[PDB]
Design a protein around this motif. Structure first.
Motif, short mmCIF file in Angstrom:
data_model
loop_
_atom_site.label_atom_id
_atom_site.label_comp_id
_atom_site.label_asym_id
_atom_site.label_seq_id
_atom_site.Cartn_x
_atom_site.Cartn_y
_atom_site.Cartn_z
N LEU C 60 46.17 44.44 46.78
CA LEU C 60 45.02 44.95 47.35
C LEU C 60 44.52 45.90 46.04
N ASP C 61 43.04 46.16 46.32
CA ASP C 61 42.48 46.79 45.31
C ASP C 61 42.68 48.34 45.17
N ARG C 62 43.13 49.13 46.03
CA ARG C 62 43.42 50.23 46.03
C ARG C 62 44.69 50.59 45.71
N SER C 63 45.59 49.63 45.71
CA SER C 63 46.89 49.80 45.19
C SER C 63 47.24 49.67 43.70
N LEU C 64 48.53 49.89 43.24
CA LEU C 64 48.76 50.11 41.82
C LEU C 64 49.51 48.85 41.30
N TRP C 65 49.30 48.16 40.43
CA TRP C 65 50.02 47.35 39.68
C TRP C 65 50.07 47.34 38.14
N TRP C 69 45.89 55.82 38.86
CA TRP C 69 44.52 55.85 39.65
C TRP C 69 43.44 56.20 38.91
N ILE C 70 42.55 55.21 39.00
CA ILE C 70 41.56 55.22 37.98
C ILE C 70 39.96 55.22 39.05
N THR C 71 40.19 55.78 40.08
CA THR C 71 39.55 55.80 41.26
C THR C 71 38.09 54.94 41.45
N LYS C 72 37.36 54.96 40.45
CA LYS C 72 36.25 53.95 40.47
C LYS C 72 36.60 52.64 40.55
N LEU C 73 37.53 52.33 39.70
CA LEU C 73 38.18 50.85 39.64
C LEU C 73 38.96 50.61 40.98
N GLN C 74 39.71 51.71 41.40
CA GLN C 74 40.51 51.40 42.49
C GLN C 74 39.68 50.95 43.96
N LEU C 75 38.88 51.92 44.03
CA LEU C 75 37.95 51.66 45.30
C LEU C 75 36.68 51.53 44.81
N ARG C 88 44.34 37.39 53.46
CA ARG C 88 43.21 37.58 52.45
C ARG C 88 42.79 39.13 52.40
N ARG C 89 42.05 39.31 51.27
CA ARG C 89 41.65 40.76 51.20
C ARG C 89 40.30 40.65 52.45
N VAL C 90 40.52 41.58 53.32
CA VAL C 90 39.51 41.68 54.07
C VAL C 90 38.99 43.05 54.17
N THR C 91 37.84 43.47 54.36
CA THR C 91 37.45 44.78 54.07
C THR C 91 36.58 45.45 55.29
N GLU C 92 37.05 46.30 55.94
CA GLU C 92 36.20 46.91 57.07
C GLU C 92 35.51 48.02 56.91
N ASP C 93 34.98 48.72 57.88
CA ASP C 93 34.00 50.05 57.67
C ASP C 93 35.17 50.99 57.97
N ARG C 94 35.53 52.05 56.88
CA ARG C 94 36.35 53.15 57.07
C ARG C 94 36.14 54.13 58.52
N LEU H 315 36.74 38.85 51.47
CA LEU H 315 36.49 38.82 49.91
C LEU H 315 37.10 37.73 49.27
N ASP H 316 38.37 37.61 49.31
CA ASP H 316 39.24 36.67 48.71
C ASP H 316 40.62 36.61 49.03
N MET H 317 41.50 35.84 48.41
CA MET H 317 42.64 35.92 48.61
C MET H 317 43.20 37.16 47.56
N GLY H 318 44.31 37.87 47.29
CA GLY H 318 44.50 39.04 46.81
C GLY H 318 44.79 38.87 45.43
N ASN H 319 44.48 37.73 44.69
CA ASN H 319 45.01 37.09 43.43
C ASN H 319 45.24 38.22 42.33
N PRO H 320 46.27 38.80 42.08
CA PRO H 320 46.37 39.87 41.19
C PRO H 320 45.84 39.89 39.83
N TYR H 321 45.34 38.67 39.48
CA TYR H 321 44.94 38.45 38.20
C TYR H 321 43.39 38.76 38.04
N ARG H 322 42.60 39.09 39.01
CA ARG H 322 41.45 39.30 38.64
C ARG H 322 41.27 40.63 38.19
N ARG H 323 42.00 41.38 38.04
CA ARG H 323 41.99 42.62 37.18
C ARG H 323 41.98 42.45 35.65
N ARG H 324 42.40 41.41 35.12
CA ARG H 324 42.35 40.99 33.91
C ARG H 324 41.08 40.57 33.39
#
Lengths: 187, 82, 111, 54, 103, 137, 55, 345, 76, 127, 45, 366
Positions: C60-65, C69-75, C88-94, H315-324
RNA sequence: AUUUAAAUAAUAUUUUAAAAUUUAUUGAAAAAUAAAUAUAGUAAGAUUAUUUUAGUAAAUAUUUAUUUUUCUUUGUA
RNA sequence: CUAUAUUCUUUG
C-alpha cells in the motif's frame, strides 16, 4: 577376499572345511531391498555424471552444449563414484544368485521328502498378523491398528452423528441443527 | 553502532570467527596416570591406589603398609570436581 | 536432529537481556526493538504499516517499506484514501465519521 | 518410553495401570511414559506384550 | 436493577467476522443467546468492522458508559464481564468502609 | 482464549489452519527467563543481586595424593594394544534368526557391516570379539 | 581448505549442495527468478572458470 | 511445614466447584410423545426446615428403614404441594422420591399410581430436567418389576437409554475438568495435581442413573432367559461408558517441574472445546456463515459483493517495486492488464 | 555443634557417658550415603536359629509325634 | 509455640497442636499423659469420662465408641502421619489412582461379561 | 525491577508543583505515600 | 496488556463511540438469528467452503475417515499404485483413492494414493520440527552483522586519568556503554546457528503434511501441468478456466510438477515453468519429499575465513516441499509424475521400516 | 569373557575501570604520538520483565527418589 | 617431584 558367499582368502590359506554346509531356505529378503536401492543408485550416478547444461537465461546461455562436469572431473567421477557402485550392486546380485541355486535344492529335497502341498505349506512365512500389514480390511476385527481409533468400526459409536442441513439463503452452507450445551461459567 | 558516527565511518578492525578449543582438552593426563574409572552405566567410581609409600616403609607395621595396595574409590567431591 | 531453536525463528528480536544464548539474535547496538516506540509513551500509528522481514506481497502506498514518512510520496492526495480490495490497490474517497441524528454518518473528509 | 503403540493408546494405558499401580503414567501422541521403572518393568512390558499376542 | 427495572440499556459489541481473534465470535455463538433470553430488556448492538475494538461496552439509563477490555479474553470471561455490566447501576463507587455501609 | 493443543489437532485436523498452530513438544517451556543463582533459588531478572557473588565469579570463566601407576597409565592405549569392540553372540544369533544374515554363508565382518547389524562407529582396529553372553547353545 | 569439492555436482538438480544462507521466507515473482538465475550461474561460472583455467 | 488442619480451614477455590447447569429436554419435544412412539409398535413456606426434613428423609431411606422415610416424604411433599405451582420441578421430584418410598414398604399400587402421575406431570412441563425424567422412569421400572411385570420394566429401562442417547450431551460435565491436570507445575511433591481425576458417577447423576438402569434391565434379561436382549443392553451400556471416557481424554502437557510461569493458567482453565463438540461442530460440517458485505475480499465470480464505498479507482496490484527506479517500472508494466483478464466477467 | 545434646532423643540426654556427636553419627541417623541402610545387624534376624523352629517331628512312631514340644530354648 | 524449644514443640506436635488458640481432643492413655506433662505450661486441660462423653453428644448408652469408630471412614482428611511430604503426595496420588482403576475395572468387567454372553450365544447358535 | 511507574504516572495530579511536574520525583512521592498508608492501614487505624 | 495486570481494564469509557454506524451495524435479533462469522469453536481463520473451496468428493466429516473414494468406482478407469502398497506404522490403514483432473477441469480416470505417503497421520510435534526448521533456515544470515568493541576506531589510550576528578573512571571508551560504541559479544553471521535436519525427520514431516492436505480435502491430482505457450496470460487462462485462486488475498496453489503418468520428469515442464511467474500466491516445487544429508565441514572451528553460519553447510533449497508453504497455499496440485517419483524414492524406505517377520514375506508376495 | 541401558551431539560462558607492560615512531639534553580487549572475591560500581505457592565435610540451591508396621506425630534420601 | 633401590621387600 570375502564379500561373496564362499569365504575370504584367509580361510583358503587356513584350510577350514566350509564345503559341506547344511543348506536351509533363506528367502534373501533383506538383500533384495539392498539390491533395489543399489540398482537405484547406479543409475543416479550415470545421470549425474552425464548432466549437460541447458541454461534458460540469456547471460548464462553461452555454455549450453557442455557437460556440467569438467572432463578431468567427469573421468574421475567415472572411476571413483560410478564404476565402484556397479561393483556394490554386483556383489548383491551374486549373493542372491547363489541362493536361488540353494533354495531350488531345498525345495526339491522337501518336495521329495514331503510332497508339494506339505512342502509349499512349510516353506510359507505367513504370520497370523500378516494381514495387518498387507490387507488390513481382513484384520479389522482382530485388533485396532488405526491412527484414528475413534473411527474404527468397533469404537465408531463414540463419534457423534450431527443433524445437518444445507441452506440456500446462506449460500450453500451446510449447518448443524443441534442445540448448543449451556456451559458452567461461575463460582 | 548511529548514522552520524565519525568512529564507525572510518574503518578500523574486522573481527573474524574465533577458533574452538580441543574437544578433549579437559581429560588431562595427570588424572589418566593416577586413576581409572570402573563401573556399570550410571554408576562409576574413579579408583586410585594410596600414597603413604615411598618415604618411610620400615618400622611401621605390615598391615598399615599393605592397606596401600588396594584400589579405592576417590572421595565423591573430588570425583564430581574432576 | 536436535529440534530447531524456536527463539531464533525470526519472530522475536529482544533487546539484549542478561539471559540469552549465543544463537539468540538480539538487535543492533543503539536501535530499539519496536519501530514506532521512539519514546515509551509513543503511540501505535493508525493506518501506517511498516513491512518487516519478507518483501510485502501487496505494498500500500501510505505504508512503509525500507522508507520514512515522506508525506508527499506516501499519500499523493490527502483527500483520497487507499485500501486493499480483491487483492488490488483500490482507492476510495476519504470520509470522516460525524454524529448526526444519533447514528454516525459519513461526510466527505476534505471539505 | 513406549513408542510404537498404534490404536486406542488409552486402553493400553488403562491396562498399563494394572501392571504398574504405583508408578506415574503419561500419554502423548506418539508415546507412553512410565516413571521410576527400570529394566525390570521393561522385562515385564515385554512379557505382557509377548503374552498378549504381539 | 432498581424498582423492577434494569439500569442497563445497550451493550455494544464490536467484532471482525473474517479476520482473527475468535473469542468474540465464540461469544456470539455459544454464550450470547443464553444472556439475551435471560435479560430480554437489554438492547445488544453488534458492530462488524475490519479492525474491531476488542472492548465490551455498557450504556446505562442515566447516560453513562462503562467498558471492559476483552482482548484475547476467553468467552467465559467476556460473558462474565457482560453479567458484570448488568449488575451495576453505575451511579457511584463508594469504598467499603464502616461509614459507607449505610448509604 | 483457547489455543489448540496437541490433542485437539489430533482428533480433528480440520482446525490446523496456519503456522501458529504448529507449536512444539509441550515439554518446551520457553527461553531461559531467569538466573540460576547459586544457593538462592532461581532468582528473577531485575531482582535482588545481594546474594550474587558466587554466581558472578562462577559466571566469568587431590590427585597428587594418589600415586602414579604403570608409567603409561592404567587403561592406556598404545600403538598396537589390541582393544576389541565386543560382538555378543546373542546379537549375532538374533540377527540370524531374525533374517538379516545367511546361515548358508561364511559370515565375515563385511557381511555384518552390510547387513547393518554393526554400525560404522563401532568398527575399529582390531575389529571384533565374539563373546557368548547369555547363550548356552 | 576442505570445503567438499566432490559433492558440488552430486546433487540431482542444479540448486543443491550450494550453501545458500542469503534467502527469505517469501520469495516474490522476480526474487524467484533471481534465485533461479543465481543457482544456474553458480554452476555455469564455476564450470566455465574450471574449463578456462585448465585449458 | 506440614498442616494438621487442627483449627478451622477454609476450602480452596478449585475448578471442579463450578456451578454446572442441568440438562433440559428440548422445547418442541414432549415426553408422552416419545412414550406413544413406544406404544406404537409464591406462598411462604419455610422451605429450609422442610428441606432439612427431606434429607433426614432419604437418610432414613438410605439407612435401610423405609416406613419412616415414607412419613417424612409425606410431610415434605404436602409442603411442596402447597408451596409450588402446577407441574413444578421440585414437586414432581419429591413425589418421585415418595413413589420410591411407597414401593419399598409393600404399598406397590400406591407407588405405581404416584409414578404415573409423575409421568403425566412430566408430560405437561415446559422443559423438564433431563435427570428427573430418567430417575422417574427408572422408578417406574423398578416398581413394575416389583409388581411382576418384567417385560414392561425392561421396556422402561430401554426407553431410558433411548432418551439419554438422543437428548443428552455426554461431554458437557467434564468440559472444565478435562484440562485440570495441566495445572501441576511440581513433580516429586504435590504431583497429584497432574493426576487429578473426577468420576463420571458424581459430576453427572444422569449417567449413573442410566447405568444402573441398564444393570437392572440386564439382570431381568438373565432371569427371563433373553440372550439377545442382554447382549443389546450390555452393548448399549459399554457404548455409554466409553462415550463418557472418550470425552475425558487428553494428552499430557509439560511433565517435569516447571518453575514459575503462573500466568499460564489463564490458558489451562478456559473453555476447552470438548471432543464431543469438536466433532459435532467441526468447521467443515457446521460452516461459518461469512458475509461479504462486511469484507474486502470475495471469490472471483462474486467479485462485486465487497463492502461498497465512495468513488473507487482500481489502480493496480500492490507490486512493491513501483517505488524503485525506471527499469523496475519498465518491468511490471503489463502485469496489471494481464491481471484484469484473469478476473473479468 | 560439639554440644553434649547432639543427635539424641530428649529422653537420652541424661546419658553423658555416650555422646552421639560427630559427623558419622549425623550420617547414621539421618541415614546418608555410607549408612543408607543402618544397623546392618538389626532386630528380626537371628543367626542362631534362622527363624526356623527346632522341634523334632521326626519321631519314629507317628503317635508320639508331638512328644517333644515346649523344650525350652533358654531360661524364659 | 515459637517461644519454646523444639522438644516442647515436638510434644505439641504429637498433641496435634499447631498454633496458639487451637483445641484438640486426645485419649487418657499413659503415653498422652507423658506428652501433656511436658507441655503443661502451655496447654490447659479438661477431662471427660466416657459416660460424660456419651452424654455430651446425644449417643444412646447401649452404643459403645468402638463400633462408632468402626463405622466412620478412614478416608477422612489428613488420614495418616506419613513420614515426609513426598510420601504424603504419593498417598493422595494413590487415592486418585484407585478411583481411576475403580472405573476402569467397572468398564472392563462389563466388557468381560458381554464377551462371555457373545461366546455362549455363538456356541448355542452354531450348535 | 518493578516500581509501578506506569500506573502511578496517572496519579500525579494530586501532587503539588515539583512532584507533579517532574516524573521520577512524583513517582517517589506516590510510592512512598501508598506504601506508608498501606502499612498504616493494616496495623494501626 | 497481560490479563492479570491492572493495566488491563483501563479506558473504562471512550473505547466505543456510543452511537451506531448507520450502514453496517445491527441489533441482535434472537436465537433464530445467524450472525456473520459466529462459530462455537476458536477459528482464527473462519473460512467456509465458499471462501476457500475444497475439491474432493465429500466435504470432510467426522463420519468419513478421509474425504476421498474408499473403493474404485465402476464408472471410471482405475489406476493402481505404481509400487505395491505396504501399511507401515502411522498409516491410515484404509484405502485412499483420488480422482484425477484433466486440464479442462473435467474428471478423468481415478488413481489410488499411497497411504505410506498420503496416509501418514499428522501429529503436531513433527510438523513443528519441520516448520521451525523452515523459518530458522529462511532468514537472511548475511544481515545479522553488527559492530564490536574492537571495531570502533577510537584511540587506544586512557582518555582522562582517574585520580582527582569527579569524572567516572573511563579509559578506551569504545565500549558498549557509549553512544558511539559497540558490544562485547555482538551478533554476526558466523555465530548464528543454521539447524541440521536429518532425512528421517524431513521425510516423516513432509509425509504428514501431505496427509494433512488430504484430510482437509485440499489435495488435487492432475494429468499434466502444461501450457500452450510459455506466456503468462496462458497460465492465467489455465488458472481461470479450472478455478485456481491465485490472487494474493485468495488462498494459493502449491504445484508439484512431475510430468505425466507415461512420461514423468524430474525437471519442470519448460512451457509451464516460464508462464508460472505470476505475482500472486503460488509456488512451484521439486517433486521430492526427501533431502540430502547435511554435512558440516566446519564442525569444530576449523576454517576461520568462513563467513557463513555455524551449522549445516548444505541447507534444503527453497523450491522443495515444506510445512510453511503448505500452510500458506491451500490447494496442493500434484502431477502424476510427482506421485510416481515420490513412491519410487520412498519404496525402499518403507520396506526397511517393517518388522522382520513381515519383511521376510515381501519376496513371497512379489 | 559368568554378565541386563541409551534422545551422537560439540561452536557459548556477565559488564565498566587501574597503577602497569610490550612494540614501532617523533623530540629534548623519561616525555609526546600510534597499537593492544593484561590483571583487579579487602579497592570498587552496575547487571533490564510485580501480583509469587513448600522448610532450615556440614549447609544451601536445582532435578529427582522410598507408601517399611506401634496411641498420636516426624523433609528422611 | 626427581634420583637410588627391579620378585611378594626397600631409601632420601
Amino acid at each position: 577376499s570375502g564379500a561373496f558367499g564362499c569365504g575370504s582368502y584367509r580361510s583358503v590359506v587356513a584350510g577350514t572345511q566350509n564345503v559341506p554346509r547344511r543348506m536351509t531356505f533363506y528367502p534373501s529378503a533383506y538383500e533384495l531391498i539392498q539390491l533395489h536401492k543399489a540398482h537405484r543408485e547406479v543409475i543416479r550416478h550415470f545421470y549425474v555424471r552425464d548432466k549437460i547444461f541447458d541454461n534458460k537465461f540469456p547471460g548464462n546461455a553461452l555454455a549450453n552444449g557442455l557437460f556440467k562436469f569438467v572432463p578431468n572431473r567427469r573421468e574421475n567421477y567415472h572411476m571413483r563414484e560410478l564404476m565402484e557402485s556397479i561393483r556394490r550392486r554386483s556383489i548383491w546380485m551374486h549373493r542372491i544368485k547363489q541362493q536361488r541355486e540353494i533354495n531350488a535344492k531345498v525345495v526339491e529335497n522337501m518336495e521329495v521328502k514331503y510332497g508339494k502341498k506339505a512342502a509349499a505349506s512349510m516353506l510359507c512365512f505367513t504370520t497370523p498378523d500378516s494381514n495387518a500389514y498387507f490387507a488390513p480390511h481382513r484384520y479389522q476385527d482382530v485388533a485396532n491398528s488405526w491412527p484414528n481409533y475413534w473411527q474404527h468400526p468397533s469404537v465408531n459409536h463414540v463419534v457423534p452423528k450431527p443433524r445437518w442441513r444445507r441452506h440456500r439463503e446462506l449460500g450453500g452452507i451446510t449447518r448443524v441443527e443441534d442445540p448448543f450445551a449451556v456451559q458452567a461459567s461461575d463460582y | 553502532p548511529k548514522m552520524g558516527c565519525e568512529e564507525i565511518t572510518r574503518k578500523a578492525r574486522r573481527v573474524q570467527l574465533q577458533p574452538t578449543e580441543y574437544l578433549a582438552q579437559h581429560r588431562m593426563q595427570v588424572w589418566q596416570l593416577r586413576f581409572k574409572e570402573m563401573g556399570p552405566p550410571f554408576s562409576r567410581v574413579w579408583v586410585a591406589l594410596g600414597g603413604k609409600m615411598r618415604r618411610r616403609r620400615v618400622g611401621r607395621q605390615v598391615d598399615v603398609k599393605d592397606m596401600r595396595y588396594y584400589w579405592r574409590p576417590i572421595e565423591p567431591q573430588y570425583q564430581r570436581l574432576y | 536432529p536436535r529440534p530447531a531453536p524456536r527463539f531464533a525463528m525470526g519472530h522475536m528480536l529482544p533487546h539484549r537481556s542478561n539471559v540469552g544464548s549465543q544463537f539468540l539474535h538480539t538487535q543492533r547496538h543503539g536501535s530499539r526493538s519496536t519501530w514506532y516506540k521512539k519514546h515509551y509513551f509513543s503511540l501505535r500509528p493508525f493506518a501506517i504499516q511498516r513491512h518487516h522481514g519478507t518483501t510485502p506481497r501487496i505494498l500500500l502506498d501510505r505504508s512503509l517499506w525500507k522508507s520514512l514518512w515522506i508525506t508527499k510520496l506516501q499519500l499523493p492526495d490527502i483527500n483520497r484514501w487507499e485500501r486493499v480490495v480483491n487483492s488490488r490497490r483500490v482507492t476510495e474517497d476519504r470520509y470522516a465519521f460525524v454524529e448526526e441524528e444519533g447514528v454516525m454518518h459519513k461526510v466527505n473528509w476534505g471539505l | 518410553r513406549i513408542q510404537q503403540v498404534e490404536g486406542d493408546m488409552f486402553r493400553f494405558e488403562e491396562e498399563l495401570l494394572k501392571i504398574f499401580p504405583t508408578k506415574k503414567i503419561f500419554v502423548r501422541s506418539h508415546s507412553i511414559y512410565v516413571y521410576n521403572v527400570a529394566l525390570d518393568g521393561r522385562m515385564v512390558l515385554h512379557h505382557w506384550l509377548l503374552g498378549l499376542g504381539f | 436493577s432498581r424498582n423492577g427495572e434494569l439500569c442497563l440499556k445497550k451493550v455494544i459489541i464490536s467484532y471482525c467476522p473474517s479476520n482473527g481473534a475468535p473469542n468474540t465470535r465464540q461469544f456470539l455463538a455459544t454464550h450470547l443467546p443464553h444472556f439475551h433470553a435471560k435479560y430480554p430488556s437489554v438492547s445488544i448492538d453488534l458492530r462488524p468492522r475490519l479492525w474491531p475494538e476488542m472492548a465490551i461496552t455498557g450504556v446505562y439509563r442515566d447516560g453513562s458508559e462503562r467498558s471492559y477490555n476483552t482482548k484475547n479474553l476467553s468467552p467465559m470471561g467476556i460473558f462474565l464481564r457482560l453479567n458484570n455490566l448488568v449488575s451495576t447501576a453505575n451511579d457511584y463507587d463508594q469504598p467499603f468502609c464502616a461509614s459507607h455501609l449505610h448509604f | 482464549q483457547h489455543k489448540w493443543n496437541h490433542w485437539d489437532q489430533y482428533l480433528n485436523p480440520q482446525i490446523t489452519q496456519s503456522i501458529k498452530d504448529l507449536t512444539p513438544t509441550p515439554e518446551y517451556v520457553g527461553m531461559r527467563c531467569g538466573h540460576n543463582m547459586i544457593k538462592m533459588g532461581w532468582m528473577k531478572i531485575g531482582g535482588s543481586w545481594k546474594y550474587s557473588r558466587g554466581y558472578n565469579d562462577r559466571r566469568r570463566v587431590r590427585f597428587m595424593l594418589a600415586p602414579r601407576v604403570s608409567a603409561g597409565g592404567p587403561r592406556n592405549r598404545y600403538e598396537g594394544k589390541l582393544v576389541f569392540s565386543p560382538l555378543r553372540l546373542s546379537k549375532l544369533l538374533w540377527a540370524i534368526d531374525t533374517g538379516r544374515i545367511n546361515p548358508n554363508e561364511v559370515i565375515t565382518l563385511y557381511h555384518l557391516r552390510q547387513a547393518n547389524v554393526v554400525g560404522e562407529r563401532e568398527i575399529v582396529w582390531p575389529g571384533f570379539v565374539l563373546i557368548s553372553n547369555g547363550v548356552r547353545r | 581448505g576442505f570445503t567438499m569439492k566432490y559433492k558440488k555436482g552430486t546433487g540431482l538438480w542444479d540448486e543443491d549442495h550450494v550453501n545458500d544462507y542469503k534467502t527469505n521466507r517469501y520469495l516474490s515473482a522476480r526474487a524467484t527468478m533471481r534465485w533461479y538465475q543465481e543457482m544456474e550461474r553458480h554452476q555455469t561460472r564455476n564450470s566455465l572458470n574450471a574449463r578456462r583455467a585448465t585449458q | 511445614v506440614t498442616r494438621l488442619y487442627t483449627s478451622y480451614y477454609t476450602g480452596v477455590l478449585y475448578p471442579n466447584q463450578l456451578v454446572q447447569p442441568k440438562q433440559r429436554l428440548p422445547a418442541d419435544v414432549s415426553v408422552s410423545a416419545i412414550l406413544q412412539k413406544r406404544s406404537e409398535p409464591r406462598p411462604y413456606v419455610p422451605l429450609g426446615e422442610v428441606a432439612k426434613l427431606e434429607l433426614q428423609g432419604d437418610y432414613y431411606m438410605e439407612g435401610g428403614m423405609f416406613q419412616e422415610a415414607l412419613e417424612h416424604y409425606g410431610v415434605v411433599a404436602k409442603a411442596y404441594n402447597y408451596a409450588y405451582p402446577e407441574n413444578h420441578a421440585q414437586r414432581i421430584g419429591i413425589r418421585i422420591k415418595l413413589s420410591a418410598a411407597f414401593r419399598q414398604t409393600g404399598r406397590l399400587e400406591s407407588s405405581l399410581a404416584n409414578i404415573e402421575e409423575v409421568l403425566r406431570m412430566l408430560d405437561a412441563s415446559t422443559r423438564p430436567s433431563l435427570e428427573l425424567i430418567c430417575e422417574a422412569l427408572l422408578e417406574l421400572g423398578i416398581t413394575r418389576e416389583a409388581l411382576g411385570m418384567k417385560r414392561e420394566a425392561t421396556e422402561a429401562y430401554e426407553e431410558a437409554l433411548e432418551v439419554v442417547n438422543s437428548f443428552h450431551n455426554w461431554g458437557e460435565s467434564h468440559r472444565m475438568l478435562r484440562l485440570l491436570p495441566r495445572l501441576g507445575r511440581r513433580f516429586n511433591y504435590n504431583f497429584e495435581e497432574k493426576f487429578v481425576y473426577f468420576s463420571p458417577f458424581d459430576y453427572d447423576r444422569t449417567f449413573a442413573l442410566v447405568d444402573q438402569c441398564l444393570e437392572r434391565a440386564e439382570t431381568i434379561f438373565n432371569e427371563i432367559g433373553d440372550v439377545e436382549g442382554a447382549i443389546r443392553v450390555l452393548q448399549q451400556r459399554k457404548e455409554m461408558i466409553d462415550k463418557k471416557f472418550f470425552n475425558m481424554r487428553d494428552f499430557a502437557g509439560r511433565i517435569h517441574t516447571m518453575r514459575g510461569h503462573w500466568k499460564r493458567r489463564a490458558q489451562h482453565l478456559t473453555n476447552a472445546p470438548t471432543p464431543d463438540e469438536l466433532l459435532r461442530y467441526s468447521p467443515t460440517i457446521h460452516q461459518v456463515h461469512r458475509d461479504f458485505k462486511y469484507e474486502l475480499t470475495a471469490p472471483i465470480g462474486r467479485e462485486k459483493e465487497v463492502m461498497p464505498g465512495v468513488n473507487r479507482l482500481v489502480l493496480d496490484m500492490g507490486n512493491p517495486y513501483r517505488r524503485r527506479g525506471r527499469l523496475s517500472n519498465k518491468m511490471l508494466k503489463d502485469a496489471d492488464h494481464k491481471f484484469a483478464n484473469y478476473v473479468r466477467q | 555443634a560439639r554440644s553434649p545434646l547432639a543427635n539424641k532423643s530428649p529422653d537420652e540426654y541424661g546419658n553423658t557417658w555416650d555422646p552421639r556427636t560427630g559427623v558419622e553419627w549425623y550420617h547414621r541417623l539421618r541415614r546418608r550415603g555410607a549408612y543408607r541402610h543402618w544397623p546392618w545387624a538389626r532386630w528380626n534376624d537371628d543367626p542362631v536359629r534362622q527363624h526356623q523352629e527346632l522341634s523334632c517331628r521326626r519321631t519314629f512312631s507317628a503317635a508320639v509325634t508331638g512328644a517333644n514340644e515346649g523344650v525350652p530354648l533358654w531360661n524364659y | 509455640p515459637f517461644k519454646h524449644s523444639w522438644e516442647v514443640n515436638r510434644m505439641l506436635r504429637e498433641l496435634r497442636l499447631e498454633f496458639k488458640g487451637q483445641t484438640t481432643i486426645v485419649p487418657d492413655i499413659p503415653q498422652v499423659r507423658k506428652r501433656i506433662w511436658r507441655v503443661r505450661h502451655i496447654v490447659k486441660v479438661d477431662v471427660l469420662d466416657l459416660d460424660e462423653a456419651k452424654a455430651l453428644i446425644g449417643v444412646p448408652e447401649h452404643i459403645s465408641f468402638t463400633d462408632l469408630a468402626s463405622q466412620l471412614p478412614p478416608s477422612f482428611g489428613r488420614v495418616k502421619a506419613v513420614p515426609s511430604p513426598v510420601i504424603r503426595s504419593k498417598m493422595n496420588f494413590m487415592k486418585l489412582r484407585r478411583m481411576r482403576l475403580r472405573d476402569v475395572l467397572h468398564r472392563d468387567a462389563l466388557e468381560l461379561r458381554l464377551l462371555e454372553l457373545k461366546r455362549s450365544a455363538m456356541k448355542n447358535a452354531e450348535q | 525491577h518493578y516500581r509501578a511507574k506506569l500506573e502511578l504516572d496517572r496519579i500525579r495530579s494530586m501532587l503539588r508543583g515539583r512532584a507533579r511536574l517532574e516524573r521520577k520525583v512524583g513517582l517517589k512521592r506516590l510510592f512512598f505515600l501508598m506504601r506508608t498508608q498501606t502499612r498504616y492501614r493494616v496495623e494501626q487505624q | 496488556s497481560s490479563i492479570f495486570s491492572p493495566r488491563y481494564d483501563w479506558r473504562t469509557s471512550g473505547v466505543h463511540d456510543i452511537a451506531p454506524r448507520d450502514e453496517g451495524d445491527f441489533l441482535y435479533q434472537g436465537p433464530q438469528h445467524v450472525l456473520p462469522g459466529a462459530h462455537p469453536l476458536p477459528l482464527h481463520h473462519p473460512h467456509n467452503t465458499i471462501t476457500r473451496p475444497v475439491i474432493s468428493p465429500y466435504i470432510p466429516s467426522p463420519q468419513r475417515s478421509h474425504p476421498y473414494f474408499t473403493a474404485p468406482l465402476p464408472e471410471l478407469p482405475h489406476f493402481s499404485t505404481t509400487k505395491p502398497i505396504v501399511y507401515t506404522y502411522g498409516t491410515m490403514k484404509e484405502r485412499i483413492i483420488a480422482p484425477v483432473f484433466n486440464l479442462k477441469n473435467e474428471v478423468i480416470y481415478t488413481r489410488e494414493l499411497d497411504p505410506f505417503i498420503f496416509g501418514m497421520y499428522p501429529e503436531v510435534e513433527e510438523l513443528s520440527k519441520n516448520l521451525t526448521y523452515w523459518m530458522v533456515r529462511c532468514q537472511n544470515f548475511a544481515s545479522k552483522w553488527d559492530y564490536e568493541t574492537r571495531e570502533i576506531w577510537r584511540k587506544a589510550k586512557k582518555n582522562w586519568p582517574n585520580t582527582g576528578m569527579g569524572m567516572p573512571r573511563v579509559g578506551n571508551r569504545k565500549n558498549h556503554l557509549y553512544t558511539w560504541g559497540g558490544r562485547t559479544k555482538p551478533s554476526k553471521p558466523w555465530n548464528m546457528l543454521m539447524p541440521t535436519m536429518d532425512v528421517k525427520t524431513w521425510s516423516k514431516s513432509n509425509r504428514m503434511m501431505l496427509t494433512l492436505k488430504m484430510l482437509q480435502g485440499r489435495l488435487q491430482v492432475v494429468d499434466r501441468l502444461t501450457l500452450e505457450e510459455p506466456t503468462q496470460e496462458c497460465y492465467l487462462e489455465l488458472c481461470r478456466n479450472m478455478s485456481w485462486d491465485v490472487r494474493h488475498t485468495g488462498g494459493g496453489v502449491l504445484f508439484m510438477d512431475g510430468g505425466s503418468r507415461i512420461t514423468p520428469s524430474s525437471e519442470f515442464d519448460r512451457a509451464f515453468f516460464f508462464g508460472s511467474f505470476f505475482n500472486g500466491r503460488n509456488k512451484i516445487v521439486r517433486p521430492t519429499v526427501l533431502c540430502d544429508e547435511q554435512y558440516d565441514y566446519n564442525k569444530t572451528a576449523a576454517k576461520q575465513r568462513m563467513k557463513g553460519p555455524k551449522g549445516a553447510k548444505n541447507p534444503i533449497p527453497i523450491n522443495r516441499f515444506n510445512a510453511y508453504d503448505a500452510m500458506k497455499h491451500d490447494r496442493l496440485v500434484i502431477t502424476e509424475g510427482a506421485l510416481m517419483q515420490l513412491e519410487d524414492e520412498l519404496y525402499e524406505h518403507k520396506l526397511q521400516i517393517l518388522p522382520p517377520h513381515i519383511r521376510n514375506q515381501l519376496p513371497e508376495y512379489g
